[PDB]
Amino acid sequence: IEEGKLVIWINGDKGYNGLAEVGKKFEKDTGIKVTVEHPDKLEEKFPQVAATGDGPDIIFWAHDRFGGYAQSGLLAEITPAAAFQDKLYPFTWDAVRYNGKLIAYPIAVEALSLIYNKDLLPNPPKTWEEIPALDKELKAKGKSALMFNLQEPYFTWPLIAADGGYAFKYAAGKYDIKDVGVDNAGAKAGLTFLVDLIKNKHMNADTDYSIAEAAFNKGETAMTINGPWAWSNIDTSAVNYGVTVLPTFKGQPSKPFVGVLSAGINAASPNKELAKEFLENYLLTDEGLEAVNKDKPLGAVALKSYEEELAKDPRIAATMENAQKGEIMPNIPQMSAFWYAVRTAVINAASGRQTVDAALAAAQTNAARAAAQLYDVMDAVPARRWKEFVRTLGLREAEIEAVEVEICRFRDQQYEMLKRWRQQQPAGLGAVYAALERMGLEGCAEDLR
Amino acid sequence: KIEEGKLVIWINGDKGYNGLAEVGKKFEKDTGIKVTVEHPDKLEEKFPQVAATGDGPDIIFWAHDRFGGYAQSGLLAEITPAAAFQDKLYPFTWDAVRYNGKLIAYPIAVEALSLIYNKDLLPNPPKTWEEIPALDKELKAKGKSALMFNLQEPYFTWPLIAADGGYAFKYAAGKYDIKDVGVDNAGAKAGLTFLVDLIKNKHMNADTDYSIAEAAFNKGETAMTINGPWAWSNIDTSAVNYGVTVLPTFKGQPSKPFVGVLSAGINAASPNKELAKEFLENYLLTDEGLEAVNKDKPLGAVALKSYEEELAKDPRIAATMENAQKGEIMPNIPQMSAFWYAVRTAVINAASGRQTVDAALAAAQTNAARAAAQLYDVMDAVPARRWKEFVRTLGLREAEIEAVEVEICRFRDQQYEMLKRWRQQQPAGLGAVYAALERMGLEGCAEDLRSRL
Amino acid sequence: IEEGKLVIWINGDKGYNGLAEVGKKFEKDTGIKVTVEHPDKLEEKFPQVAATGDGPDIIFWAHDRFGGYAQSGLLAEITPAAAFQDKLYPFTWDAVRYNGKLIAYPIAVEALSLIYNKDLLPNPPKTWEEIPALDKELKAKGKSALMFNLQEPYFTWPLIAADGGYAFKYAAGKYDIKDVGVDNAGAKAGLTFLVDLIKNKHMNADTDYSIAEAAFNKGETAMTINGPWAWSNIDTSAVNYGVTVLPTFKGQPSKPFVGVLSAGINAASPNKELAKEFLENYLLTDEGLEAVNKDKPLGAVALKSYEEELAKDPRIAATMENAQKGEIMPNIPQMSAFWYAVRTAVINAASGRQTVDAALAAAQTNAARAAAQLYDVMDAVPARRWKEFVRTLGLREAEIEAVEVEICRFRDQQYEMLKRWRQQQPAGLGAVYAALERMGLEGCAEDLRSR
Amino acid sequence: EGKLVIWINGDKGYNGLAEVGKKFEKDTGIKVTVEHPDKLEEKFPQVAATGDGPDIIFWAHDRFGGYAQSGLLAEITPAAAFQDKLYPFTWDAVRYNGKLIAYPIAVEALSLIYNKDLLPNPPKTWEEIPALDKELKAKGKSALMFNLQEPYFTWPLIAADGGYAFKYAAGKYDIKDVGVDNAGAKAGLTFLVDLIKNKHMNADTDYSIAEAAFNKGETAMTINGPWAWSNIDTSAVNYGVTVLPTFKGQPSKPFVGVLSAGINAASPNKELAKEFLENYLLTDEGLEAVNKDKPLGAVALKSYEEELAKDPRIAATMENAQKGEIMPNIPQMSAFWYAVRTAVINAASGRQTVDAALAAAQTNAARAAAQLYDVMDAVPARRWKEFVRTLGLREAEIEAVEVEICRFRDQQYEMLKRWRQQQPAGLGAVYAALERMGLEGCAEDLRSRL
To answer: Which InterPro entries match (chain B)?
Structure first.
């Protein structure tokens, strides 16, 4: 990493030119030219390059991968003055905190909202409980009240959590993995309500993101649940739409997972003090965050001064309202196990293969079981290259032999090698995907993404 | 349930079952409390299942190592012997009958390996392992060998591996730290190097097993073997004139054979527990009572000091006790299975050249605390078509079975997860696996899985 | 085998005592001792003992299993005089023929019939199509119209074949294995009717032999489909019963498979002619077939004279009527693959697993594939005793090592050893079942024997 | 119609063939297009299964038997007078079920390569090599190093005393008559293992190790074909090519490969092809026009081989070819190579005794299943059904397996097994299918083992 200058990695779908323009304003006042790059799969290239002391100085990504970055220590700890922290919304700072330490700066905020067709419905329902009655009056007229993706628990979670569902308990400065909240009464109530919507033919268990978007963009349904990323396809659509707060359930607010785009600093960067100046004094300001907003919009921002001017749009105000009422998505690696156990729980409850209590009881157990993902890795790798793969991952030759001397069957050996390998090296540092690209198996990598 | 006002006792048939009936029959003359001594088959295995039902005998006699599993599910009553009575038994015997701070049984007999030497070929057996290579070359001039013993099961090689610092699990405060295993330390590392060097220097052959060594010693072809008091019977009918003595030292330190203590535990579901404690202490465990059992079939070395002093006059029994006091009590925890697995593989690979001594013991140290290899063995002992009937019979509850099925795709992967999870709702060993196979009419599969333990 | 003596194996559920007496009057007139014994699981121990030139002189079993015995050459060819063959019904002789030569004597005839509760139903339906209306009228009274085993295709086949279904075509003197008829329109129509009966809740896809037997004998349903073997359990039952012709479908008779109890004689027997005298002149007569019938009934018999006197019983007359309307079950070894392909098709069609045309399309391709049966063996024997198993089967050590050296993965090795073993030995000679019992794994044999 | 499109691989004189093919143009008018696409070997049967592809195909004779049994090459009918213009054994290489399938052009076989400076007189028999080897390992050298990983290089010795792959009787290869377990093969491979036991060769030597050692003067002899000659030319070593040593008095018998020109069975210009091949290609000028673009080695045509048999290396190649065997063009040779490769490597390493290795190779020589289990483990299990669809296995055939077969690996083999006789080996379907899945890696790594 070149001394005395700033290199920044931000994803190609963001206003990388606008950030370059904030950076050359930083060049005039210092002499520090910043070069903004938007590599592909930077999220996965960064922990690899950074682990050997290379890579960019600053990276922009969703806060949720920073928990893994910080767990192997690849991000510098920031300690901004309390006066600076007060300029941003407090819950955004919770999103970039890991073992008590702040690891990045919050930039932008995103959450799901209720999107309603103003023509088909000028006054959207404020409660989930109104929607069944609303739906019969409108399917008399060939329209339905609501369609949204029921295949990812990301879209179904706001309802399951409204009455008391939650992923992992966060008490002081840590997420208690021993405390899962998929089997509590509130979660059973939320998922029972969604399953009843399907049993009462108010929604179809097969609805996915494309079906639901299609229905809403061809005016076939009055409401959908989607994020600010979907606003553009409905803008090109002929539909006239509004964005507002998610409906309530049992009087309680729906709680969507919140994602915060964040700027972390390379723990191996020699320009750490220069990185903090660009973010604190040039980027995280109203003029700087607007130079990036106008290249490609950020939506709701973590900095209060600039959001209050962006809440001009009731759509952006709704995103923030739903964000303040929801959870920050946890940045810990076991969130993978959580998603797979829950997604399976919703699909089985919605299809009838499991009852609500059985689906959520199984998801309670499986949310803390990482085995299902190693079997997936095993069957994503051609069996003929299992031990080449396990070495390329960096499992030591001594542990490979310890498995081979005691474990007979071949499939059992690779599971033992993988299970042991994961305990020696925490997720997620792009190790598996880098190993597969270093074996000439990028297909396996892409298919595993 | 069990019968109050009567004592029922289970002891294995290879023990002095009649002699115990008679001390119990003299115990009735003074009370009227009839003893019924029974010697069922697979008693070790029937008791924890039967006892889990508030059933079984009142007192159980078995090797101490299996009372730790019994005691972990609370199937044995805590004993409260008088402090004066505890002084009547050798102190280390009491260490064998601990589980998590409480005493669970009375020690009766003590067993360990000894050095057995042919007096004609060798009137004065070597006192150190380091003498044996020189002893063997001088003696291969006459077509014989100095020493052969079983090199296949680590039970017979462990006394050398542990002499200089080897150990199974560290035992500190009445508990075995199962994450503190000691087969990769310098003493083990030295002990096994000496053993494989004996093989490299063609003083022993890596393939020698129990029958080859027993035959060779009993046919006068070798001067020394390592075996326990059970083998003495084949040596007596044999023409060989033999001596029994203390194992040789290694690097100045004693060889440490594993010690087994035959023990009497009391059923936690027995209502006549207090009546039971009197029979063992006051009638059985004295010179008079255990002499009645010794005479039906011998006990070897016994835990009670007074009577061993009459049995130690036989230098063979004195050697067993000497080797016992210098050895290591076999831990009563179930993870001893994983230990036996890993160490068996290490010794075999080090003796054959697959691993150097450091690699074999490093691998065995890692694998010594991992139970997975034993569940893959269970999976392959049951026909795959009856896998899900099997784990149900084991008592894995129907909800966790479903939790596995909905998340795990491949079937072999499912069965491992169900067994692995079942292993965590229920500790070994109460014969859950053997009762399950043998209630499914698959006694055969049980034996074939029972053969390896 | 003792020369100058006849030893015969008949199954223990048949009139072995009455057959002993046919043999003992054979003794008054002969000097030749005959001994009737009824070993258990005889069907599988006979080819084992017989393969070494031992075993009984005559064996009684269902004709379908003589095709395997006869393909390994374990049964002597009969050539009875044409005058004798005309005493038996001709289709019975087709059941004991294999590659043009006759391998056994026909004895008894067996087929499914419609069994109806005359109290709940004085006039049973003559057509399948009446049954949905009959079931609606009758479930008003908490009762069911018809329940029979839908797990095993033996009971479902009469309907699938009525309109044109058929197992393997029989043209000259053999069954054309490239010509299976489970994917034709008639088979689709019969199974479509069965699946519709379930969709319209006139039957449940889960009814099995024991559930259906209980339901009819506890008066809960008015009709079942079962064979003469089930008649005694309803006799002790309180149910008043009738036996009659199976219903028609699309105007055509339903066609049940016919089983012929048969007496073949050991190809290694030195008393072949003496065995033929006992069967031709003493057993297959009115007196001989009554001596065993009266110990335990045979049902319908292949001998015309004695059937005409047993057909007084309308129950036995019905069995013969349906047998003649049905098709002889083929005695060829591919019938294992066919039954297994067809079994899954019915169960999947009846449960919704597959659509009717997909289930029958799969059964069409899979009907000639025996691979599925070796994989069942693999998962019926515990993996740690696999090589003991294949050795006990007699697959030889060069053959085991040849597989191990070239095939990497364990199950791939297990399939390769069996595949090579099966090409050295045709099914079915009880090889797998004997091997598992010699390993002390009768349990595994028990449960693999269940299929 | 009205055109000839011709496929030859790039390691041959494809321009020189254009040069004679354009002279076939001047006198006829039927444009010939000479192309050298990659993976020609497997791109041809895919197009030809669609009635498409080149008019002429050039490749080694061994795979035309697979082409011809799926009926993708036209039967050629050369004049009896034309047939003598080629060496008689060449025609045996391009005959299939009595029918001739292609015209022979060039013939290739392994020879003994000896470094003349380190050894002026190479040993003429194998039994001399242990003694010759001791004198030279006194000087840090070895007598002989050659690839002991591929049975192609080990076979000449194994066959000297009576070994043989498949017996060729009438116009057919008898698949139940394999000769890798006879006394001659046991004697040849026992001699090979004894050379290894007596540390005269190392069981792990491979093609690059052996090539490097001989070209850096490290060893006095190697066994290799005419393809390796230029790397020895660029090497500073000056070498000689001669007849393989004898073993127990009989000649070493290397496999013979014949480069051949077949005619597409779906080509409408069949007569035009035979006019170009017989009258323009297979001539002294025509086979020379390609030879100096890139040398062919030994050629099947009688007059022109005498014209480069002047080169003692090519004369040695032909001598050894005449002493060896036409490699069978039948598909069961895949199973044969795999069974024999396992035998040699296990015999050389000690895993098996010589008779046990050869007994297994005897049984396994006609068994193709080992190749399908490799396919199963070359594709990630999670993409099996995408793979199997890309192969063209029909959806009814897939469901029929899943409906009947319980366990996952068993389903995969049953799908491949059923697929293989609906489409016989070998048409490169597996390798083409993997490349359309974004799995070039898996494809390459599975094509590395063949």
So the answer is: Maltose/Cyclodextrin-bd (IPR006060), SBP (IPR006059), SBP_1_CS (IPR006061)
- Quote the distance between the C-alpha of residue C267 and its chain's center: 23
- Give the number of C-D residue pairs with CB atoms closer than 8 Å: 86
Q: Chain D: residue nearest A446 by CA? A: D438
**Closest by Cα among D52, D112, D102, D57 to D77:** D102
Torsions phi, psi for B244 (to 5 deg): -115, 125
- DSSP-derived secondary structure letter, C62: E
CATH level 2 (architecture), domain A111-257+331-351? 3-Layer(aba) Sandwich (3.40)
Residue with tokens 């004697």: D187
Domain D354-448 CATH superfamily: Death Domain, Fas (1.10.533.10)
Out of C375, C401, C408, the one facing D405 most closely (by C-beta) is C375
Do A443 and D445 lie within an 8 Å CB cutoff? no
Q: Is C409 on the interface with A (CB under 8 A)?
A: yes
Beta-carbon separation of D405 and C344 below 8 A: no
Q: 3-state SS of C398-445?
A: HHHHHHHHHCCCHHHHHHHHHHHHHHHCCCCCCHHHHHHHCCCCHHHH
Please name the residues between 384 and 403 in chain A that touch chain D, using a CB distance below 8 Å. 384-385
Q: Answer whether B412 sits within 8 Å of A408, measured CB to CB.
A: no
Superfamily of domain D109-255+329-349: Periplasmic binding protein-like II (3.40.190.10)
Closest to A110 (Cα-Cα) out of A305, A329, A289, A406: A329
| Level-2 CATH architecture, domain A356-449 | Orthogonal Bundle (1.10)
CB atoms within 10 A of CB B142: 8
Q: Which residues of chain B have a CB within 8 Å of the CB of A398? A: 359, 362-363
Rounded Cα distance between C61 and C74, Å, is 14
Class of domain B357-451 as given by CATH: mainly alpha
Nearest to A351 by CA among A224, A212, A254, A207: A207
Dihedral, CA of residue B380, residue B381, residue B386 and residue B387, to nearest 10? -50
**Of A365, A372, A401, Cβ closest to residue B363:** A401
Residues A64 and C31: their CA atoms lie apart, in Å, by 96
In this structure, are residues B192 and B350 in contact, taking their beta carbons and an 8 Å threshold? yes
Which of D404, D410, D417 is facing C362, going by the closest CB pair?
D404
Residues 6+ apart with CB under 8 A from A321: A244, A245
- Tokens at residue B209, please? 């097993």
Bridge partner residues of B116 (DSSP) = B225, B244
Reported structure resolution in angstroms: 2.5
This structure was determined by X-ray
CATH code 3.30.565.10 for C356-450: no
Q: How far B379 CA lies from chain C's nearest CA (Å)?
A: 8
**Cis peptide bond N-terminal to B429, omega within 30:** yes
Q: Is B411 within 8 Å of chain D by CB?
A: yes
What is the CB neighbour count within 10 angstroms for residue B374?
21
Which of A384, A389, A410 would best serve as a mutation to test chain D binding (most D beta carbons within 10 A)?
Answer: A384
Count of pairs with CB atoms under 8 A, one residue in A, one in C? 4
Q: Helices in C76-220 by DSSP H: which ranges? A: 82-85, 90-95, 131-139, 153-162, 185-199, 209-217
Strand stretches in D149-254, DSSP E: 164-168, 173-179, 221-224, 239-242, 246-247, 250-251
Top CATH class of B112-258+332-352 equals alpha beta
For an interface test with C, give the residue of B448, B450, B451, B452 to mutate (most C CBs within 10 A).
Answer: B448
Helices (H), ranges, B353-410: 357-367, 372-379, 387-393, 398-407
In chain D, the largest separation of any two C-alpha atoms, in whole Å, equals 70
CA–CA gap between residue A200 and residue D213 (Å, rounded): 79
- Cis status of the peptide bond prior to D426, with omega within 30 of 0: yes
